């Protein structure tokens, strides 16, 4: 919880942790995390609404989310110190009331945008 950083531009948490999750189709994934990208000036289509685009990585490779990504966290491990931190994740997941509470790293595209 000493590496735990709360970003306030998107109400998510940055934490060096992995996730073992199961979707609504019983599929299992091990050692997976997420990365969020704040790009407020993205060239949106007529149907883009979310200000942040999130990529899910498992085993060092990004996932193509072809199905519904509703999921539950079964075991969250903090990478630097192998102590199980799942109880903190679920406690934090309820509070923020936002999709994908804990994220491996947040990328801010605002400061690099030419319209910044």
């Amino acid at each position: 919880t000493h590496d735990l950083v709360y970003h306030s531009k998107i109400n998510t948490f940055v934490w060096d942790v992995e996730f073992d999750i199961v979707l609504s189709d019983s599929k299992e994934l091990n050692k997976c995390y997420f990365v969020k990208c704040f790009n407020p000036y993205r060239i949106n289509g007529k149907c883009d609404f979310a200000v942040s685009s999130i990529d899910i990585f498992s085993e060092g490779k990004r996932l193509l989310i072809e199905n519904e990504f509703n999921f539950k966290i079964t075991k969250a491990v903090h990478v630097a110190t192998s102590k199980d931190v799942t109880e903190i994740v679920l406690h934090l997941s309820e509070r923020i009331s936002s999709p994908f509470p804990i994220v491996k790293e947040v990328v801010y595209l605002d400061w690099s945008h030419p319209q910044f």
């Binding site: 060239i43 200000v51 999130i54 990529d55």
Partner: protein, 629 residues
Amino acid sequence: YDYHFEVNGTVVRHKNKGFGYMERFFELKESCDERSKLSKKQYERFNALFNFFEKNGVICMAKDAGTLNTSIEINSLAYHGKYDVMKKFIEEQSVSIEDDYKKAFFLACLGRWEESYDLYSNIILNSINGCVYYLSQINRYRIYQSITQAVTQFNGLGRHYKPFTDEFLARIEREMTNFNIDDLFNGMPFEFQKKYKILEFLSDNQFLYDDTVKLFELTNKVSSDIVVLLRLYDNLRFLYENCLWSVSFHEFHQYIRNSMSLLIEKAEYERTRDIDELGFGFFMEYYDFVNISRHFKIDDIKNLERSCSIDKIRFGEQEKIEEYLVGIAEEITKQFSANGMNVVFYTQFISEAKAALYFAKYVKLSEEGLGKIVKALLFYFPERDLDIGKRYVWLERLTKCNELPKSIISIIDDFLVLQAEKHIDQNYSEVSSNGLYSRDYGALIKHFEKNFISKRLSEITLCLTQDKQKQIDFLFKLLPLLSTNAKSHLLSFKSVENINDLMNGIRIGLIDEFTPEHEELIIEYLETRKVNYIDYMSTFGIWYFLEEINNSKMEEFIGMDDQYDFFVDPENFDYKKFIPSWLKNYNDKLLGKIAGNKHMKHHVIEVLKERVKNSNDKRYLEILMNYFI
């Protein structure tokens, strides 16, 4: 200490109690009548003295100061990044030992540290005024320090590189074992230590402690900005024109980072303070652009963009900046299009390469130049440093001052087609650290043209079969660029049968308009959720508010998600279930559409007013400020 020699070239009497020779010298300089009174030997000495003082920018005394012109001119190929020219200078046979010293600095500047170490050892052998001997001893120890640091860095870190042979590594360790740079000046001839006392500071571990502590004045909130800048230029000119390898070390790079940043922040503070009282400062030049490019990291530039407004800073010598930018982009082609990559020269140059093009957002570039930078950035930049995700941002930044013309559009189209070419392999997948992919480049072209059709991509799309699935879904992110025939050909490969295929279609841009069928598919999912009541539900709600859906049978499912009913009918929504956290997830278009709804507006403006007062959140404050939501 008999006089002060100020950075603007004005001499001030300080501590001498004898005859004033500096005042007398300047009187001899201004008027030629007294010059003929000197002897012939003293006449040629005065001419040599006069040449030295005008070359070093020491013009006259403080009380005779008039229209002072302090323009920085660094006569060094190394500072300007003339990589080709120094190579030619190295190749040529060196006439004198002074040329060898310039060569060894150029070899060090070009990453050939083993050759410079050998050259510096050679110069030391043949140089026992003895000033080049001392400077070579300083530089050989410096390059030995650089080699030792690089070996440690390479052992710690993308692929295993061995630029220095272990025989060379063992040799320099045996030559530099128990080598004291501190005793170097004291062991010099006593004539040298008297004549060249000003060169002693080069043997110290740190030599910019004085310049860094004087930087504290730039934070004063009560000229000095010219003094810090001219002191910076003095340090640059001495370290480059005299070819001293300490100019590439961390202490000097950090000092330029500290001095340049604080000068920029101080000017930013003066502007805001002026507007507060006057109610409506720093002017960068070619040298400032080089200093920021060479010494600032991308993070360090990022700290600059957030703190101040460089768009308010006007850039001069833009053709010289462009010449620097076309000159640097040429070297990337030489480094990577050919097999000329120098792994040691790689590490130092790419950081300057990344910073220059990142900072190239604020400069107006000609078309022929802009093509060279874009083509070098898009194609020849290695993916390890500038990946696909970061590279577009570097490319997209160049559009701030240069609105994308046809020729640059062709280059990006060339990049997109080449990206499609690598997708013949099923294993190939774009890796982006910014969550940003080849779709974003095509969106940029469609943003700047709105009518561009990719002919070569159309040919690739029409050639597609059901087998090479990696190519099919890749070009679905490039649908607007394809022709109608290519669009019709591609659409046959995906189906929209169930609701999940609709979301996949909406995410990849497969369809941008809602035929009534998807509304029923949209409708079918919601009734199942309503039946199964006792992620997407919030997503559907926004589309109805964004006028994406005109089915008007959306109100049956009001009551499950607080975001759903918040969007379907703002007038009937209860705002005690409102959570301010949603507005942080909303993009520019959606927030603006909420602002002009004339409903929901006074509720959210109240929730934003409450949040900023209670929490003082900048994101909430800026969301409220920009769109008045």
